[PDB]
Design a protein around this nucleic acid. Structure first.
Lengths: 103, 97, 95, 87, 93, 105, 97, 87
DNA sequence: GCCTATCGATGTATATATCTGACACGTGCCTGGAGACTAGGGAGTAATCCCCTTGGCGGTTAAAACGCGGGGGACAGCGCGTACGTGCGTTTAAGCGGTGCTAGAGCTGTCTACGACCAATTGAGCGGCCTCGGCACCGGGATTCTGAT
DNA sequence: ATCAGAATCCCGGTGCCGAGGCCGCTCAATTGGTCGTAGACAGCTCTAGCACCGCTTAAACGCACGTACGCGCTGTCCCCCGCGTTTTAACCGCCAAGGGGATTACTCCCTAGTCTCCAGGCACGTGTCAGATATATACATCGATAGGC
C-alpha cells in the first residue's frame, strides 16, 4: 500500500484513481498523487490542530461545527484560503465596533 | 425595572453571536422557497435537507450584508442603518449595479 | 444497496495523531469530508490548466508544487512544499 | 372573527423580529423602520438567483426533486461555496 | 509559425451583420480573446455537469443546460433558440 | 458540400471546435451534436456584440471598430454587463458618468 | 487676472478623461516599479514589452474601479473629498484585505 | 548642484498628478491630500499579488521571461480576466 | 438685495486640407478537416424495488403582534478656518531614437524511460450492528453588571 | 461611589442517543508484465531584450491666495427602543399514502479508432484610404461687475 510506503494516512490509490477517472489530464504521473495526499494531509492536520484547541478553550472533547468556524476565522492564513466559503451551523466571530459600546 | 435604550440590544449581540443556530422560522422559509419555484418550473419536490441548506446560504448572506452595512452606517457618523445604506453596500460588492 | 465513498476514517486517523483525547461530531465530519474534496478539486483543477498552458499532457509531481504555491497563501505554501517534497523523497527511496 | 383569513404574502413570513435578530448577529445596535420593507426585497432577489440555478441542474438530470447538491452545486456557480451538507 | 485564431471567422460574421464596417487589429484581438473566453466558460461548465450526473460524454443537451446557467434572461432565451435551429438543420443534413 | 459549417448554416468552424473540445480534456467522448450547438452559441454572442459596437461606432462617425466602441457597447447593454462583470477591456476608457451631487446648480 | 471658481476646472477635467482612452500613468516610471517588486521573489527576470503594458491596464482599471467605489462612500458621508478612511472602507466591502 | 542625486523610491514614480488623473477618470471632483500616501500602498500591495503569480507560472515553464500570458493567466487566477492581449 | 446682463476670455466644436499608417486583398501552400470504414460499450429502456416526501390534524407553547411612552438620535442650520484648488514660472525626467551585444526563446531531432494497459489476487474499507458516555440539561445558589441615589 | 435588581454563571445531578468499536464482506487496490508514446535532452538560429547616451518638450514641481468646503456646534423633532399583554402560527407528533429515486439487466447505436486525402486557412506581400493631426473658424459657455429692480 502506497499510503505507508510514503508514510502518510490518506489513500494514494484513491486519489490516483480520482486523477484519471476525474479527467484532469490524459496522463497522471506516479509522483503526483503521492505528493498530493501529503498536501491534503498537512492541511487537514492544520485545521484540526486549531479546531481542537477551541475544544479545550470551551472544555469539550468532541468537535462540533462551531469550533471549525472559530479556528478558520481567527487564523489569518487560513482565512485567505477560505474567504468566500460559508460554514453551516457556524455563526460569526464575536465582534463589537468601538462606537456601539455605551459611554 | 425599565432598562435604558441600548443595553438591551447590546445583550442581544452578546447572546446571538455566541449562539449558532437558525434565526429565520423554518416553515415560513420553506413556504418562501417553494413559492419562487413556480416562476421557473411547476410541480417540483424538495428534500428536507435542501431547504435546510437553502436556509444556511440565506442566513449567511444577510448576516454578511448587515455586517457590511453596519460599517457603512458607522462611517456616515450615524449609529442606525438605513435602506439607503444597503443599496450602497450592494453597489460596491458588484451584486446590484 | 448504495455504497458511497468518503474521507471518514482518514480524517479521524489524522485527528488522533495530533489530539488523542479528542472526538468529533458527524456534523463536523461532513465538513472535513466536504473540505478536502473542495481543496482537492481546486488543486487538481488548477493542475489541469498548468500542464495545458505549456502544451503538455502529464500531471507529474512538479505541477502540483506549482499549484500549491499558487492557491495557498504566503505562509502555508512554505510548509506544504516542505511537507510535500519530504513525502516523495521517502516514497522514492522505499519499495 | 372568521369569514376569510388574511393569507399574507409569504415574504412577510420572514418576520419583523426575525430580520431584527439577523442584524443583532451582524453587529448592529440600532435598526431603522423602513429597512423591513427593503431586506425582503433583497432576499427575494437573492433566492431567485439560486433557485433558477437549482432548477436547471435538476431539469437536466430528469428529476423532480431538488436535492442537497442541486443547491450546493448551484451555490458553487455563484462562488459562495457551502460546506457541511455532504460532497 | 502557425497560430490558430478566429480573425477570419469574426470578419465573416461582421460582413454578415454590418456589411460596411471594418475592424482594427486591437479590436480583433479582443474578440479573438473573447470567443475563446466563452469557450472555457461553457465547456468548463458542461464538463462539470457530465461528471456530476455520472455520465462520461458531452452531448448537445449538456451544452443547452450549460448555456442557460451562464447567460442572463434575455440572452440565454435566444441562444437556445438559435442553437436548436443549428442542430436540427444538421441532423436533417 | 463538405464543410460542416455550411451544413449547419453557420460561419464559425465546427471541426476546429470539435478538436478543441477533445484535446481540452473536458470529457472522454465528445458527442457529435455538441460542436454544432456550441458553434451557434458562439456566433450569436459575437453577433450580439459586433452589432452593438457598430451602432455606437457610427455615432462617433468612424468606419472601423475601435476598443473604445467595444467598451462603450458592452457596458451600456445590461444583458452584456451581467456576462462580462469582471472582465477588463484594454483601451476602454469608462462610461461617461458624473453624479448629480458634484454638478453646480 | 483670470481665474475660474475653484471647483470648475475639475468638471472640465472629468469630461476630458472620460472621453480619452489613453494610459494616464506614464510608461517609464511604471516599468521601473514592476522590476523592483519581482526582485524580492526572483532575481534576474526579463520582461516582454507587452507584459509591462498588460500589467498596466489591469493596474489602472483596478484603481479606477476603486476610485469609482470610494467616490460613492464620500457622497454617502455628504462630502466631496475622498478622505483616506473611504478607501479602507471601500476595500472592506469588496472583501479585499 | 550635483554631488549625489535623490534616486527616489520608485513608488513615487506613480506621481501626484498621475494619481489625480486617475481619480478624474473615476468621477471624483475633489481629492484629499493624504490620499497620495495611501494609493501607493494599494498599488504596491496589488502588484505584489499579481507578480507572485506571474513568476510562479514562469518558474514552472523553465523560462526567464515573464511574457504576456504569464500575466493574463495570472490575472484569470484572481478572477480579473483581461482581454485584448492575445489568447 | 436680486435677477439679469453682457462682456471677452478661455474653451471646445466644426471646418477642410494633407498625409501616414494598418487595413484588407491576393497568393502559394501545407496542415488538418472530411469521407470512409469497422468494433465496442455507454447510454437508453424496461422493470422492480422500497424509501421518503407531501398531505393534513391535533395540541402546545413560545414567539409574533399590537400599543405606548419616552428619550436618544437624525436631522438641519450656523460659524469657524484650514486645506484644499488655481495659476504661474521653473525645473525635470518621460519620450523618442539610437547606438551596443547576446541571452534566451523557439526550433528540430533524437531516444529512452514512464505510465497506460491488462490480468491475477486479497484485504483495506465499506454497511450494518451494537453499546456506552459526552453533552444537553435544569435548578439552585452565586455572581456581575445595571440603573438610581 | 454608593444602593438594590434583574440577568448571566456556574455546579451538579441526570440520561439520553450519537459516536465508537466490531464484525463480515467485496469491490478495488496492488503486484506484474508488456509497450509505445511523451518528454527530456542536446544542438541550433536569431529575434527581441537590455544597457547606456543624445535631445526635445512636455508634464511635474513648487509657491501663494483664498475660498468652499470640512467641521463641530446647538437645538429641535420624532422615530425609534422597551415593556406589557393578548394572539397565532410554528414545532412537534402522527397518520397514509404513492410518486419517484435508484436499483437491475439488456440491447444497440453511436462514438472512437485508424486510414487516405485534399482544400480551407494560414503567412506574407501589397497597394491605399481612413483616421491622425491641424489650423482655422465660429460658437459657445463663464465669471463679473454692471445695471436697475
Amino acid at each position: 500500500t502506497r499510503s505507508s510506503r510514503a508514510g502518510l494516512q490518506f489513500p494514494v490509490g484513491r486519489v490516483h484513481r480520482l486523477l484519471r477517472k476525474g479527467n484532469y489530464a490524459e496522463r497522471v504521473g506516479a509522483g503526483a498523487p503521492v505528493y498530493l495526499a501529503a498536501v491534503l494531509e498537512y492541511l487537514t492536520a492544520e485545521i484540526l490542530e486549531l479546531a481542537g484547541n477551541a475544544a479545550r478553550d470551551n472544555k469539550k472533547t468532541r468537535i462540533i461545527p462551531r469550533h471549525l468556524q472559530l479556528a478558520v476565522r481567527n487564523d489569518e492564513e487560513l482565512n485567505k484560503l477560505l474567504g468566500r466559503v460559508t460554514i453551516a451551523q457556524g455563526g460569526v466571530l464575536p465582534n463589537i465596533q468601538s462606537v456601539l459600546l455605551p459611554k | 425595572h425599565r432598562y435604558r435604550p441600548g443595553t438591551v440590544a447590546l445583550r442581544e449581540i452578546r447572546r446571538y453571536q455566541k449562539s449558532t443556530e437558525l434565526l429565520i422560522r423554518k416553515l415560513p422559509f420553506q413556504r418562501l422557497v417553494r413559492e419562487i419555484a413556480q416562476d421557473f418550473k411547476t410541480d417540483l419536490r424538495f428534500q428536507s435537507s435542501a431547504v435546510m441548506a437553502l436556509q444556511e446560504a440565506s442566513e449567511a448572506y444577510l448576516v454578511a450584508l448587515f455586517e457590511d452595512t453596519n460599517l457603512c452606517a458607522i462611517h456616515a457618523k450615524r449609529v442606525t442603518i438605513m435602506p439607503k445604506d444597503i443599496q450602497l453596500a450592494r453597489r460596491i460588492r458588484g451584486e446590484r449595479a | 444497496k448504495t455504497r458511497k465513498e468518503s474521507y471518514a476514517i482518514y480524517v479521524y486517523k489524522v485527528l488522533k495523531q495530533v489530539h488523542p483525547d479528542t472526538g468529533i461530531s458527524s456534523k463536523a465530519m461532513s465538513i472535513m469530508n466536504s473540505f478536502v474534496n473542495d481543496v482537492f478539486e481546486r488543486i487538481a483543477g488548477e493542475a489541469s490548466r498548468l500542464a495545458h498552458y505549456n502544451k503538455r499532457s502529464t500531471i507529474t509531481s512538479r505541477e502540483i508544487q506549482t499549484a500549491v504555491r499558487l492557491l495557498l497563501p504566503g505562509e502555508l505554501a512554505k510548509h506544504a512544499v516542505s511537507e510535500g517534497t519530504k513525502a516523495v523523497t521517502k516514497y522514492t527511496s522505499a519499495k | 372573527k372568521r369569514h376569510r383569513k388574511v393569507l399574507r404574502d409569504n415574504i412577510q413570513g420572514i418576520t419583523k423580529p426575525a430580520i431584527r435578530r439577523l442584524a443583532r448577529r451582524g453587529g448592529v445596535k440600532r435598526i431603522s423602520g423602513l429597512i423591513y420593507e427593503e431586506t425582503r426585497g433583497v432576499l427575494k432577489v437573492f433566492l431567485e438567483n439560486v433557485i433558477r440555478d437549482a432548477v436547471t441542474y435538476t431539469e437536466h438530470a430528469k428529476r423532480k426533486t431538488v436535492t442537497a447538491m442541486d443547491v450546493v452545486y448551484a451555490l458553487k456557480r455563484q462562488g459562495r461555496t457551502l460546506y457541511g451538507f455532504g460532497g
